[PDB]
Amino acid sequence: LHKEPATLIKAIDGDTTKLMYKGQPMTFRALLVDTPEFNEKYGPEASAFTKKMVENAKKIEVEFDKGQRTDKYGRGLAYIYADGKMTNEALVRQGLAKVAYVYKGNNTHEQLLRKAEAQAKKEKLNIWS
Numbered sequence: 001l002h003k004e005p006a007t008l009i010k011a012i013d014g015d016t017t018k019l020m021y022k023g024q025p026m027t028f029r030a031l032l033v034d035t036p037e038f039n040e041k042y043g044p045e046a047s048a049f050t051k052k053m054v055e056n057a058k059k060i061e062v063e064f065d066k067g068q069r070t071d072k073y074g075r076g077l078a079y080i081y082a083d084g085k086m087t088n089e090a091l092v093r094q095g096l097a098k099v100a101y102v103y104k105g106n107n108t109h110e111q112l113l114r115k116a117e118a119q120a121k122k123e124k125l126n127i128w129s
């Protein structure tokens with residue numbers, strides 16, 4: 001897989017962010033994870049966490065997987081990096097997202113993310129508390 005440039009337009013919530021990608025505004029949904037909605041327990045924390053990552057980053061990148069690049073809502077489906085740190089994995093490692101929505105063909109980083117979720121669960125972090 002390959003990282004490609006994007007710039008932040010605005011934080012939305014834990015697993016969605018508005019980015020400019022090839023010069024066009026797009027909402028990106030993070031592959032392989034599910035954060036709680038803002039109105040559920042840990043939703044505000046998950047939103048805050050991703051917001052801090054993307055707003056503080058000097059360089060945001062998006063990495064598509066081998067399968068679908070947009071979902072049925074027109075959202076880009078990617079792994080989203082902030083200064084080289086993947087937000088998808090960082091949310092799971094902190095117990096602020098669950099590995100979820102693992103569809104055959106867009107699942108390159110599944111095992112990396114499961115390893116993180118195991119560690120967050122062992123630490124009883126947040127969602128796992």
Ligand SMILES: Cc1cn([C@H]2C[C@H](OP(=O)(O)O)[C@@H](COP(=O)(O)O)O2)c(=O)[nH]c1=O
Pocket residue numbers: 029030031032033034071072077101103106
């Ligand atoms: C993460 C992801 C979500 N989706 C769709 C499945 C879910 O459909 P439904 O809306 O019908 O439930 C929705 C989950 O996203 P959200 O968790 O952002 O709501 O997004 C994909 O199709 N592919 C994906 O890779």
Ligand SMILES: [Ca+2]
Pocket residue numbers: 015034035036037
């Ligand atoms: Ca969600």
